[PDB]
Coordinates of C-alpha atoms in Angstrom, one line a residue:
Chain A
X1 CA 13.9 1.6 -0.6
X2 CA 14.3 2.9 2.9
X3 CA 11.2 5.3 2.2
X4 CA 10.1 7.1 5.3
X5 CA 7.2 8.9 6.8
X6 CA 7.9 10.5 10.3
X7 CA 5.4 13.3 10.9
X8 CA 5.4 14.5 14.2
X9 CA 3.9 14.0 17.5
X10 CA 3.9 11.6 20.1
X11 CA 1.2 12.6 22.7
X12 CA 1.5 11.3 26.3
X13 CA 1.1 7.7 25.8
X14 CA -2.1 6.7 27.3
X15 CA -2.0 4.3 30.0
X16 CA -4.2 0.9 31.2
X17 CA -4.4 -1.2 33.5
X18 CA -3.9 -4.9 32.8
X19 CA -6.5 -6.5 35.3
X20 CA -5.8 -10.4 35.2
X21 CA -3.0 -10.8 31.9
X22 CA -0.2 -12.1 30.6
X23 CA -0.1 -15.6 32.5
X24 CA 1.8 -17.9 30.2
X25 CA 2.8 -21.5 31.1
X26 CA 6.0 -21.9 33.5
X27 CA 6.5 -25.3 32.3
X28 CA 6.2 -28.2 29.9
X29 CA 4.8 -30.3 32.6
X30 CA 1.2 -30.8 32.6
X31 CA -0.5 -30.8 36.1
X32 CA -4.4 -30.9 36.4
X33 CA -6.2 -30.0 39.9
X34 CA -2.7 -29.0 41.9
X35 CA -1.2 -26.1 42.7
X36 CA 2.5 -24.9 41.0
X37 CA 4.4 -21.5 42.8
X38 CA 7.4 -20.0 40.5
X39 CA 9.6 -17.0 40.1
X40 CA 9.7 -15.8 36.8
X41 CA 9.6 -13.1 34.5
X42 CA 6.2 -12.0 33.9
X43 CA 3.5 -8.9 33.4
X44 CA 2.4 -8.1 37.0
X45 CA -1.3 -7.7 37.5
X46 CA -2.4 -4.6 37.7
X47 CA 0.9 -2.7 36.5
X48 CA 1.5 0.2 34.5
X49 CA 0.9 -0.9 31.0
X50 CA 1.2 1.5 28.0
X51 CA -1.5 1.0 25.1
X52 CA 0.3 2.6 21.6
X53 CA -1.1 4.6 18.8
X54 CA 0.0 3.1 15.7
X55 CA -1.1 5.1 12.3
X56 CA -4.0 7.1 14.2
X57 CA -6.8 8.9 12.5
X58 CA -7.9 11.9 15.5
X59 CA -11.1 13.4 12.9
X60 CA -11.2 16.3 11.0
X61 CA -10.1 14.7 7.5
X62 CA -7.9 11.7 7.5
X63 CA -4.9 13.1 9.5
X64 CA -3.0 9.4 9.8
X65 CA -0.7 9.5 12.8
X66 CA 2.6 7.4 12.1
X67 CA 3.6 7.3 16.0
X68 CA 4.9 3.7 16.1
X69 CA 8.9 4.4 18.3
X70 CA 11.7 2.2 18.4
X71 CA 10.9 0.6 21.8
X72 CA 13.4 -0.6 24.4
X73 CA 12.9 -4.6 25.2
X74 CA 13.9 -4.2 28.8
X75 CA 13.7 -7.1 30.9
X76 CA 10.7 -8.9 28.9
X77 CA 8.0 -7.8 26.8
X78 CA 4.4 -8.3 26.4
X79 CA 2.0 -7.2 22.9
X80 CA -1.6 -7.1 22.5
X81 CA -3.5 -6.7 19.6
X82 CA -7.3 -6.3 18.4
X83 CA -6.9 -5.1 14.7
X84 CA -9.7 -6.8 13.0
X85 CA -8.4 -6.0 9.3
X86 CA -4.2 -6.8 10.0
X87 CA -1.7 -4.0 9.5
X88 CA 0.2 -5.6 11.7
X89 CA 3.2 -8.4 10.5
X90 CA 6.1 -8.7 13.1
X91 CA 8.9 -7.1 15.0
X92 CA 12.1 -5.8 14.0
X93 CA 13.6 -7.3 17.6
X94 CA 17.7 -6.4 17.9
X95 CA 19.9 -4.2 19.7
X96 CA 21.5 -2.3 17.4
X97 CA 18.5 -2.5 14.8
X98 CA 21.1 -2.4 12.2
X99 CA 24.1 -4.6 11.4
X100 CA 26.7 -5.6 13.9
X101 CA 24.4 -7.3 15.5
X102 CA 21.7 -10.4 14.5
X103 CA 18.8 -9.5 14.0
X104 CA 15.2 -11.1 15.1
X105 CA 12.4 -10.4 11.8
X106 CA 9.5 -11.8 12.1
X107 CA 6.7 -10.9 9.3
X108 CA 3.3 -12.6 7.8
X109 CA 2.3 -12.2 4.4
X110 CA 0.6 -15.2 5.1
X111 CA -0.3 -18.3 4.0
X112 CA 2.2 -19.2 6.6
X113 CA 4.0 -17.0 9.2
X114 CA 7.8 -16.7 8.5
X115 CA 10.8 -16.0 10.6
X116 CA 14.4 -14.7 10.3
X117 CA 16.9 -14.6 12.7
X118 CA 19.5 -12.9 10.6
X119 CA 21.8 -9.6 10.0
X120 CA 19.5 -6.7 8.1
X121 CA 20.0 -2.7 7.5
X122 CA 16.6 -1.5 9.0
X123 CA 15.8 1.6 7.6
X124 CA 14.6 4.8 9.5
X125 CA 11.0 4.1 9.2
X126 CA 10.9 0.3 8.6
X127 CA 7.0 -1.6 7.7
X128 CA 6.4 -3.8 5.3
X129 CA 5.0 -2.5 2.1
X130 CA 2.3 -4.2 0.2
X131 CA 1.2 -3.7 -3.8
X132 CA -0.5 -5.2 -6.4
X133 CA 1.0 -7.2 -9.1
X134 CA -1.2 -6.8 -11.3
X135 CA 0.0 -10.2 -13.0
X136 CA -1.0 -13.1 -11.2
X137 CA -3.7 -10.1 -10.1
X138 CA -2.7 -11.0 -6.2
X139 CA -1.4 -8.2 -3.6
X140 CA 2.4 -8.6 -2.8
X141 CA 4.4 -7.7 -0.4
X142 CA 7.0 -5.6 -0.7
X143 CA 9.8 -6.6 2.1
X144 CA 12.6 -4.1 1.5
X145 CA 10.3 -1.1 2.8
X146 CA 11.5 -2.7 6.4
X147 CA 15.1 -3.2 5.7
X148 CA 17.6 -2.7 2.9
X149 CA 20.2 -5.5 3.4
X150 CA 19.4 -9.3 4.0
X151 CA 22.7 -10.6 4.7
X152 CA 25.1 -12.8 7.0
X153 CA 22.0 -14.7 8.1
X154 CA 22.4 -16.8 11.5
X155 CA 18.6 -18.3 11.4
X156 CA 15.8 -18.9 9.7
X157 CA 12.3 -21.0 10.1
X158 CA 9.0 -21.0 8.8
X159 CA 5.9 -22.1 10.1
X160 CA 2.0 -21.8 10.6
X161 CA 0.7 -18.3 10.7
X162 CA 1.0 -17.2 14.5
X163 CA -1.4 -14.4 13.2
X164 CA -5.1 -15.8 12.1
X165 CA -8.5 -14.3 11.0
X166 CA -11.9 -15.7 11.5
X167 CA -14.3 -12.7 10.8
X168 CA -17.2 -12.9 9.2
X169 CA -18.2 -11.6 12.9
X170 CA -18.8 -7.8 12.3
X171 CA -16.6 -7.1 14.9
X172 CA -18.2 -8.9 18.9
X173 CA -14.8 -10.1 18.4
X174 CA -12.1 -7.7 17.4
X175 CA -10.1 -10.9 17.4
X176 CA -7.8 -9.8 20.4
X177 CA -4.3 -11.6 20.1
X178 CA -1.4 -11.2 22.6
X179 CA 2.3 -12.5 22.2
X180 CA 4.6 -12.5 25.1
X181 CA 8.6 -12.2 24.0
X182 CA 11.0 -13.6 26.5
X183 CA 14.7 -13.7 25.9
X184 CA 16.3 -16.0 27.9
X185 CA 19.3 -18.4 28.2
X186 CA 19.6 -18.9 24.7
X187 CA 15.9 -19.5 24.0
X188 CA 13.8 -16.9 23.0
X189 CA 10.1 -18.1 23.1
X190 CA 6.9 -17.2 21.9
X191 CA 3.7 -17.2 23.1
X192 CA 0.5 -16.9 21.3
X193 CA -3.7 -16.6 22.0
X194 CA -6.6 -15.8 20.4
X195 CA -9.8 -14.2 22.3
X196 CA -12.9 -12.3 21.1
X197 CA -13.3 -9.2 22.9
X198 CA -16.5 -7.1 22.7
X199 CA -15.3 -4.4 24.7
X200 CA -14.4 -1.0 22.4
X201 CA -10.8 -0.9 23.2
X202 CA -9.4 -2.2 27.0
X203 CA -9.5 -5.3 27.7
X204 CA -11.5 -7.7 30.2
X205 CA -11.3 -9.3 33.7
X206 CA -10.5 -12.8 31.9
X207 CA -7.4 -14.6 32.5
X208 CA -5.4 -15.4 28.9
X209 CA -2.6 -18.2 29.0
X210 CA -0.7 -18.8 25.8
X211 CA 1.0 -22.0 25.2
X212 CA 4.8 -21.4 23.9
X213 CA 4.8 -21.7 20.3
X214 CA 8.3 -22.2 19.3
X215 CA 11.6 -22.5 21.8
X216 CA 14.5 -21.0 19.4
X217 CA 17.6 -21.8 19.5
X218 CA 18.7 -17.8 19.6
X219 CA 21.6 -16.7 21.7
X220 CA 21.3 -13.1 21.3
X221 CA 20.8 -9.7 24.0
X222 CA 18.1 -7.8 22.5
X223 CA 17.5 -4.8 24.1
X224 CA 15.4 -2.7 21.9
X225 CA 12.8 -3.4 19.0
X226 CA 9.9 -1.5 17.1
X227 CA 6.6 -3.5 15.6
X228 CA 6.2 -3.8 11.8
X229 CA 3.3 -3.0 9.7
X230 CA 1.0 -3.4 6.7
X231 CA 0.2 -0.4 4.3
X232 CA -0.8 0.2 0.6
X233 CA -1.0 2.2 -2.3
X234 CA -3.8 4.5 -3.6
X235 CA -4.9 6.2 -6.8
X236 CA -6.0 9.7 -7.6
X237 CA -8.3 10.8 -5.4
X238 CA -8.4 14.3 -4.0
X239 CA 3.2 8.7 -0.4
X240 CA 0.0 7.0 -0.1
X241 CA -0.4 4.5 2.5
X242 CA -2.1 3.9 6.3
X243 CA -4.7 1.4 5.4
X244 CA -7.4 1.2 8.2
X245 CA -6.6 2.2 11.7
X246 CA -3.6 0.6 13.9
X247 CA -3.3 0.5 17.7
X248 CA -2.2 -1.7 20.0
X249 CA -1.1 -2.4 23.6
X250 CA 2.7 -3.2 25.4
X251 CA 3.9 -3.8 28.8
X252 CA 7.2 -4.6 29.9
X253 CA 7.8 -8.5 31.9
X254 CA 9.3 -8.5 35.2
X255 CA 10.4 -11.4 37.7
X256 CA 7.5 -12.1 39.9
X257 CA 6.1 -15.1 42.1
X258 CA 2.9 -15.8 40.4
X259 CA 1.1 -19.4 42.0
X260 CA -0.7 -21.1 39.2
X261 CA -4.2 -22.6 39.6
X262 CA -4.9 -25.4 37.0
X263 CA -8.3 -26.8 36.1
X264 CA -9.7 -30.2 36.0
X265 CA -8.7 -30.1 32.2
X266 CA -5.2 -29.0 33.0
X267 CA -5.9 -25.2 31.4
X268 CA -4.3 -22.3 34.0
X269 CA -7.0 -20.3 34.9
X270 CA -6.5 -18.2 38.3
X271 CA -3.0 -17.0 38.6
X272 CA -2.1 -14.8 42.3
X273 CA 1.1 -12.6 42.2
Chain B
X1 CA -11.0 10.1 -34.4
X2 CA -14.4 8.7 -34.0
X3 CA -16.4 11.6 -32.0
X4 CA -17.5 15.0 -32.3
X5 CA -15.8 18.3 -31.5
X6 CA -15.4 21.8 -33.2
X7 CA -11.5 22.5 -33.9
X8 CA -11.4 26.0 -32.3
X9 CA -13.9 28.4 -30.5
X10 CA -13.6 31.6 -28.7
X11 CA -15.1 33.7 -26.3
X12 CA -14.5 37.2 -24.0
X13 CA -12.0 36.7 -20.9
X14 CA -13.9 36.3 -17.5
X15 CA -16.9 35.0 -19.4
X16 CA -18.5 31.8 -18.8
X17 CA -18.8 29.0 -21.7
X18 CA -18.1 25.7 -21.9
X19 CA -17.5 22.9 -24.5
X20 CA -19.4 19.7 -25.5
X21 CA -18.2 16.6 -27.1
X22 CA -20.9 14.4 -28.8
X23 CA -20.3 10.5 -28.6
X24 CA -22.6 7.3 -28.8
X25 CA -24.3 4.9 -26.6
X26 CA -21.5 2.2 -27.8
X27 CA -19.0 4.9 -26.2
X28 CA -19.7 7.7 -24.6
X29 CA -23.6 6.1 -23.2
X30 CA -22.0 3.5 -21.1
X31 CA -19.0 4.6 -20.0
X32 CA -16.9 7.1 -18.3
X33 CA -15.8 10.7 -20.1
X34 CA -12.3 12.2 -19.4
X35 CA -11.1 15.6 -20.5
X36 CA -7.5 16.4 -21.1
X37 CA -5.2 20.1 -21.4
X38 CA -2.2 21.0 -23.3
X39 CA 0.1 23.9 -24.2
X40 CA 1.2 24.2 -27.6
X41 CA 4.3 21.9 -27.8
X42 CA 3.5 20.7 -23.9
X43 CA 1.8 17.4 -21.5
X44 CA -1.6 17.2 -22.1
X45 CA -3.2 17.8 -18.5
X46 CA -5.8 16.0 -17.4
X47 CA -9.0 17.9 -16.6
X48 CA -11.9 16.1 -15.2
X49 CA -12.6 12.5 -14.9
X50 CA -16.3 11.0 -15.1
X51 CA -16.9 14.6 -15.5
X52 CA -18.0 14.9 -12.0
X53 CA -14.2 14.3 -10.2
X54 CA -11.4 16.9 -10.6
X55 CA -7.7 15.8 -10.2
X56 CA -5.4 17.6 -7.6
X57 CA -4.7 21.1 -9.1
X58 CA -7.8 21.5 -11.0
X59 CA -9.6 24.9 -10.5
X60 CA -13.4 24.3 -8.9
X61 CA -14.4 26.5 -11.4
X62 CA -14.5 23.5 -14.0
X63 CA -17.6 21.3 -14.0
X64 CA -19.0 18.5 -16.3
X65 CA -22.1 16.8 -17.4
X66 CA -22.9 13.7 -19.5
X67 CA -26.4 13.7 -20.8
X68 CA -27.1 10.9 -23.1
X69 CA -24.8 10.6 -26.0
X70 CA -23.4 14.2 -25.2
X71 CA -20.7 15.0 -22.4
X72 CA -20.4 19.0 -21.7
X73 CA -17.0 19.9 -20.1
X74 CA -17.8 22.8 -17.5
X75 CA -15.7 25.7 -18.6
X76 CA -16.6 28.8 -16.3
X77 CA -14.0 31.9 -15.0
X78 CA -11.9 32.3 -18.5
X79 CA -8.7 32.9 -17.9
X80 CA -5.7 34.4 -20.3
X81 CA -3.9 31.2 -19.7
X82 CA -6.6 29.0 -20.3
X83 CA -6.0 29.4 -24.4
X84 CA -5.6 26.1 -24.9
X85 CA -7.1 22.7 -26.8
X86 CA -9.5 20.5 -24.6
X87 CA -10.0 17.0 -25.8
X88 CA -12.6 14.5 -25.0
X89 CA -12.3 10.8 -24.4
X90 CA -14.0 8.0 -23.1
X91 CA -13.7 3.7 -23.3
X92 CA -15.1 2.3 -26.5
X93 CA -15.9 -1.2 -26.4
X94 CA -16.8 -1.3 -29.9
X95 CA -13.0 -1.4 -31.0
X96 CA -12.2 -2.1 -27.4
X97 CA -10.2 0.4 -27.2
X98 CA -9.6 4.2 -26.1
X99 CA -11.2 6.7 -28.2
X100 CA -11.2 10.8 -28.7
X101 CA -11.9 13.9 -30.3
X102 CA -10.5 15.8 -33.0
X103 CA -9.4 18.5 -30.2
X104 CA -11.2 22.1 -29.7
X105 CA -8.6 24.8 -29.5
X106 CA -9.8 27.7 -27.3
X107 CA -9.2 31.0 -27.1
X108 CA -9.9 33.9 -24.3
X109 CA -10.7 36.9 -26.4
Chain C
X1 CA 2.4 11.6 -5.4
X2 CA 4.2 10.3 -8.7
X3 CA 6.8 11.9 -11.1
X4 CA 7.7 9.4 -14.2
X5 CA 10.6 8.7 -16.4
X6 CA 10.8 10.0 -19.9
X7 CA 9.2 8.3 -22.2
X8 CA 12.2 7.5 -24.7
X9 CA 14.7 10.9 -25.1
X10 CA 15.2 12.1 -28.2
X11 CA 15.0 9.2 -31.0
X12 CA 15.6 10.3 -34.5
X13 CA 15.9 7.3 -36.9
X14 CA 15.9 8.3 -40.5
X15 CA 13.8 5.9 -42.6
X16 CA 14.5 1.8 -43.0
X17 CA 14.1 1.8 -39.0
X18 CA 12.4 1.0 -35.9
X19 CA 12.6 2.2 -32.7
X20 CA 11.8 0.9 -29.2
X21 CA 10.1 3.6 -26.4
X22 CA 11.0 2.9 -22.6
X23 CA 9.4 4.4 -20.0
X24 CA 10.0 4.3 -16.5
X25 CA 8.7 5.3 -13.6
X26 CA 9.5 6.9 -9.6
X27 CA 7.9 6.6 -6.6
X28 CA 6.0 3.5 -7.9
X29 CA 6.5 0.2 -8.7
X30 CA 5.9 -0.9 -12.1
X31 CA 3.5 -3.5 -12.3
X32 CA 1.3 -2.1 -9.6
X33 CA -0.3 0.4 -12.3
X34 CA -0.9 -0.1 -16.3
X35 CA 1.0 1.9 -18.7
X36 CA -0.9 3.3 -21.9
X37 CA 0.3 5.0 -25.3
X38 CA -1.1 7.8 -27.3
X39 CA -0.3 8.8 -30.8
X40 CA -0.4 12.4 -30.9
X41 CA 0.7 14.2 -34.2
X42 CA 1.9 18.2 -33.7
X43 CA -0.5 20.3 -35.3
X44 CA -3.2 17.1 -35.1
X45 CA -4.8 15.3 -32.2
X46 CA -4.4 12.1 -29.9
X47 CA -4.9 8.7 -31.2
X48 CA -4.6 6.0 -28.6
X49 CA -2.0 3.3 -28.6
X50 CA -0.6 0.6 -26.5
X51 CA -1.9 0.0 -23.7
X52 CA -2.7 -2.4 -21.1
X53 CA -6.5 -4.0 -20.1
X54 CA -7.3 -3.8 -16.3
X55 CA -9.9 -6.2 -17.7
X56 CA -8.8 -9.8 -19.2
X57 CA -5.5 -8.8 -17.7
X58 CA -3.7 -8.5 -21.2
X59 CA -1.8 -5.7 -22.7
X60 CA -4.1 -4.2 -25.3
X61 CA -2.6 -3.4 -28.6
X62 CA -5.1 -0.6 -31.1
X63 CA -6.4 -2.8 -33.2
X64 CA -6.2 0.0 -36.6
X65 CA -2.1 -0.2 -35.4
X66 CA -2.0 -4.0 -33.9
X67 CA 0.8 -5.7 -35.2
X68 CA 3.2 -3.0 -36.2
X69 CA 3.7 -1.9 -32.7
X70 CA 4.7 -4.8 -29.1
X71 CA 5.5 -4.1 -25.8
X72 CA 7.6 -5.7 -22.8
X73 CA 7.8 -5.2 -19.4
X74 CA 10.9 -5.5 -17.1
X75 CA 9.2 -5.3 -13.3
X76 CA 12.2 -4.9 -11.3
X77 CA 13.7 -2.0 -13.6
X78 CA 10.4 -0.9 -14.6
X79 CA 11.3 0.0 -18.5
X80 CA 8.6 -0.7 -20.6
X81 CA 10.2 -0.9 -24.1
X82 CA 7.6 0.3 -26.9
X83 CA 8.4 -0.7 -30.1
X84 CA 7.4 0.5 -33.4
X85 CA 8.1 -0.9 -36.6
X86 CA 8.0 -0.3 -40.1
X87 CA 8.3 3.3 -41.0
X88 CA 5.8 5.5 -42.8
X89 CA 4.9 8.8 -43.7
X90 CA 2.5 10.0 -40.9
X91 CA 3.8 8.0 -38.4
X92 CA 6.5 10.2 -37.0
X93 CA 4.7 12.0 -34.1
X94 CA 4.7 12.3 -29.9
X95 CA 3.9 9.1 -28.9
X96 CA 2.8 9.8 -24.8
X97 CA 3.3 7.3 -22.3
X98 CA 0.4 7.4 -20.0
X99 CA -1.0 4.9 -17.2
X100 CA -4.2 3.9 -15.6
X101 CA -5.0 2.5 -12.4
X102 CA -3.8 -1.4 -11.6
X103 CA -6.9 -1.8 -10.0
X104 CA -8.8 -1.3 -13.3
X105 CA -11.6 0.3 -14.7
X106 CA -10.4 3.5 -15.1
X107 CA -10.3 5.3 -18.6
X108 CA -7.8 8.5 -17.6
X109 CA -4.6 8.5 -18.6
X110 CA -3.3 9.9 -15.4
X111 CA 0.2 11.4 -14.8
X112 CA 2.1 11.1 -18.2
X113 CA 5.7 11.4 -20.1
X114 CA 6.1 14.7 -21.5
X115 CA 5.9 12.9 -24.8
X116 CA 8.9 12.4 -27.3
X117 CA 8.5 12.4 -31.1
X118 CA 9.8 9.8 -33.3
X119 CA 11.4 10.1 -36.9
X120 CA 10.7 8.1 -40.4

């Protein structure tokens, strides 16, 4: 496969301001009405955050804008979402996003979310393609649009799709999800939320904590990474692909002294760096 | 086949005239009309769809109308390369199947 | 968008034979879009053939030829093997392979083979 659209541009990357963001949970201890102060990797509050254009529609007609760069990971990494119809999957997280080195896939054709921890061949304009089979009359998935080879593999799990729809909600939601990435001492972790946003694109004054989802057994530096996406084929009409619009929003971690307020109920809610 | 079209007609270069195909209500009344182009010994080329919808490459200058039974394919700004047989189709459900014309070969005079 | 495969090459099989018609495709996948055939005779006009349903979901088969000709599908390698059988006299022509939309409910035949006669 390995079929690639560049195009062009990048624009300057336009900025925003993450108010109150990015507080996940510092341990696996619950505490309920105290107060908990650590040093750890995190998004600082009111930092320099950059918001990506993804395949980007600027009007005249159509004009799709496949921006989407092979990103640096840096210390840590934060992702925010809205995407109310899903072109977004996973990440193609590595170093050398090709072999010689494991690679972290995550993707979500879902009736469950998926995850490989493996060796692949990522091609120069990796996303995940998706079809119709016409036989079984269901829309697949077409995997190899990402990467050539699947080989070697170190890891691999499966589980409950980290990615979820309600809808029904013509929009008042935009469904805004966040995952936080942190690679550390042989665990990489994830963490996951879910929060309707009625704003049209920034986001709010609310504080967001995600619980960690899964604490992987890893062992591997990644250093740089791109996202992965959802696209489709057409039919004559006056190659095809970009279903919908795609943007989202990325800020680097950072090791900060953040004090933790916990409610009543034991759910963070004011966090002070 | 099963519809109606002349085998050949001609007319003066640059002129404008077009060329109808006369179906039925079991095919042509309920369904969609497609046109189709070929070169002696080449690909037939498809023309219009639904009579109202050009594919990428057609000319502008081709229009089409369906009005009962009868589908006119819009044939305006004769060319000297537009010699060439047009053939009408559209779904038949009483076969359930696809169904078209004898062919109409034109000619630019 | 799309450029296809032939249709078969050049099959000449004197008569006492039958011959299978493989088309494949580029820069799609096979069973995202229906194939279609055409009978077209030179000096004559089209009569369909073949075919696949985007309704029902089967592969139609012209009922005047049904029976005399099959088709198989092979997704992966996306050959389509046409086969006709038992030879007659006006049944050596350009048999087109053509294609509809996988998402149905369309009647034009789309970007074809460049046709390929057969031989009785």
């Amino acid at each position: 496969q390995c079929v690639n659209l560049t195009t062009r541009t990048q624009l300057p990357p336009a900025y925003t301001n993450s108010f109150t963001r990015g507080v996940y949970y510092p341990d696996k201890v619950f505490r309920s009405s105290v107060l908990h102060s650590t040093q750890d990797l995190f998004l600082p509050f009111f930092s320099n955050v950059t918001w990506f254009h993804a395949i980007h529609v600027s009007g005249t007609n159509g004009t799709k804008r496949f921006d989407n760069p092979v990103l640096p990971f840096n210390d840590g990494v934060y992702f925010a979402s809205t995407e109310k119809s899903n072109i977004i999957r996973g990440w193609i997280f590595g170093t050398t996003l090709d072999s010689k080195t494991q690679s972290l896939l995550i993707v979500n054709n879902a009736t469950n979310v998926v995850i490989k921890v493996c060796e692949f061949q990522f091609c120069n304009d990796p996303f995940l393609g998706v079809y119709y089979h016409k036989n079984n009359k269901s829309w697949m998935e077409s995997e190899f649009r990402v990467y050539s080879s699947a080989n070697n593999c170190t890891f691999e799990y499966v589980s409950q799709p980290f990615l979820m729809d309600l809808e029904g909600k013509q929009g008042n939601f935009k469904n805004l999800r966040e995952f936080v990435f942190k690679n550390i001492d042989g665990y990489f972790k994830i963490y996951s939320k879910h929060t309707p946003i009625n704003l049209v694109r920034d986001l709010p004054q609310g504080f967001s904590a995600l619980e960690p989802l899964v604490d992987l057994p890893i062992g591997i530096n990644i250093t740089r990474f791109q996202t992965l996406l959802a696209l489709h084929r057409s039919y004559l009409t006056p190659s095809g692909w970009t279903a919908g619009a795609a943007a989202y929003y990325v800020g680097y971690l950072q090791p900060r002294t953040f004090l933790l307020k916990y409610n009543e109920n034991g759910t963070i809610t004011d966090a002070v760096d | 086949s099963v519809l109606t079209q002349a085998p050949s007609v001609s007319g003066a270069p640059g002129q404008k005239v077009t060329i109808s195909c006369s179906g039925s209500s079991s095919n042509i009344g309920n369904n969609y009309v497609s046109w189709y182009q070929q070169l002696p010994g080449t690909a037939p080329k498809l023309l219009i769809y639904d009579n109202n919808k050009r594919p990428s490459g057609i000319p502008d200058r081709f229009s089409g109308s369906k009005s009962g039974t009868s589908a006119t394919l819009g044939i305006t700004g004769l060319q000297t390369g537009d010699e060439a047989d047009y053939y009408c189709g559209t779904w038949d459900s009483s076969l359930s199947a696809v169904v078209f014309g004898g062919g109409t070969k034109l000619t630019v005079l | 968008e799309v450029q296809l495969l032939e249709q078969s090459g050049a099959e000449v099989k004197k008569p006492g034979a039958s011959v299978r018609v493989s088309c494949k495709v580029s820069g799609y996948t096979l069973p995202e879009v229906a194939m279609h055939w055409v009978r077209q005779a030179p000096g004559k006009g089209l009569e369909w053939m073949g075919g696949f349903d985007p309704e029902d979901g089967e592969t139609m088969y012209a009922q005047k030829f049904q029976g005399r000709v099959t088709m198989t599908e092979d997704t992966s390698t996306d050959t389509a093997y046409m086969e006709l059988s038992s030879l007659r006299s006006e049944d050596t022509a350009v048999y087109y392979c053509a294609t509809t939309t996988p998402f149905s409910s369309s009647y034009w035949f789309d970007p074809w083979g460049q046709g390929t006669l057969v031989t009785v």
